[PDB]
Ligand binder design. Structure first.
Ligand SMILES: CCOc1ccc2nc(S(N)(=O)=O)sc2c1
Ligand SMILES: [Zn+2]
Length: 258
């Protein structure tokens, strides 16, 4: 018995093994656009992904991760509300069984079809495992996906999913350029939060972009063909691997735009 998104082990049960689930800075949250405070102190984001080196794609039983070499400052995030340099380590998505759900964050209670998370860690802490123990250890860039026109930069990912259908499977995935997944504008909202899967540690500066990217129905359909289970196990489709919104408590969401 282990955590998941099922009836018997989903997000409402997580607190029994991970009591920080009922914490003061949990994620995701609903972004109320009218109560978000514009902050003119906030800088533009600096996304430097020209030298990224992707290595692998892995089905870990709850999503698929694209992993990067983070042994050097190749692909880094700076600026915005951040102090210091954060290295990209992996990205993954959360998605729904239907196009009207699947994102983790919501915007004025609107749900999107999926949410992309680009996970970065603060190089001051030397390794990812140390960074997750620090209140400023991680910076996660969140991008919403809406269904419409296809996203060409996503297709290389969609085409390899058949090779990692079940939990524990991995495939080589080199020379993938994550710049192809970014929207045109880098205007964002930011708040202090947590990992959205166990262990739910409260180490994340969330940076959620205002502008969604569009993907085709056929692309997201391919996500829903993945399996939570391992090969040879009873087939459970990997859908609805999103955590619902958590209370904001004593936090303020800031906007970099008005
Ligand atoms: C410490 C084991 O690695 C983890 C565990 C949970 C986790 N959640 C996220 S998310 N959904 O981007 O907030 S990235 C991440 C990395
Ligand atoms: Zn995530």
């Amino acid at each position: 018995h282990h955590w998941g998104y099922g009836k018997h082990n989903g997000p409402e049960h997580w607190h029994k093994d991970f009591p920080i689930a009922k914490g003061e800075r949990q994620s995701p949250v609903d972004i109320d656009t009218h109560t978000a405070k514009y902050d003119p102190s906030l800088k533009p984001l600096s996304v430097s992904y020209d030298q990224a080196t992707s290595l692998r794609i892995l089905n870990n039983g709850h999503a698929f991760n694209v992993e990067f070499d983070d042994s050097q400052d190749k692909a880094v995030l700076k600026g915005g509300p951040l102090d210091g340099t954060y290295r990209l380590i992996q990205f993954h998505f959360h998605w729904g069984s239907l196009d009207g759900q699947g994102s983790e964050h919501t915007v004025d209670k609107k749900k999107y079809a999926a949410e992309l998370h680009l996970v970065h860690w603060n190089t001051k802490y030397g390794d990812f495992g140390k960074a997750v123990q620090q209140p400023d250890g991680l910076a996660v860039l969140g991008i919403f996906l809406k269904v419409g026109s296809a996203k060409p930069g996503l297709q290389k990912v969609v085409d390899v999913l058949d090779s990692i259908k079940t939990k524990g499977k991995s495939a080589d995935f080199t020379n993938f350029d994550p710049r192809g997944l970014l929207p045109e504008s880098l205007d964002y909202w930011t708040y202090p939060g947590s990992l959205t899967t166990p262990p739910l540690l409260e180490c994340v500066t969330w940076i959620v972009l205002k502008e969604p990217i569009s993907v085709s129905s056929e692309q997201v359909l391919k996500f829903r063909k993945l399996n939570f289970n391992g090969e040879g196990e009873p087939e459970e489709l990997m859908v609805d691997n999103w955590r619902p919104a958590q209370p904001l408590k004593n936090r303020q969401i800031k906007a970099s735009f008005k």
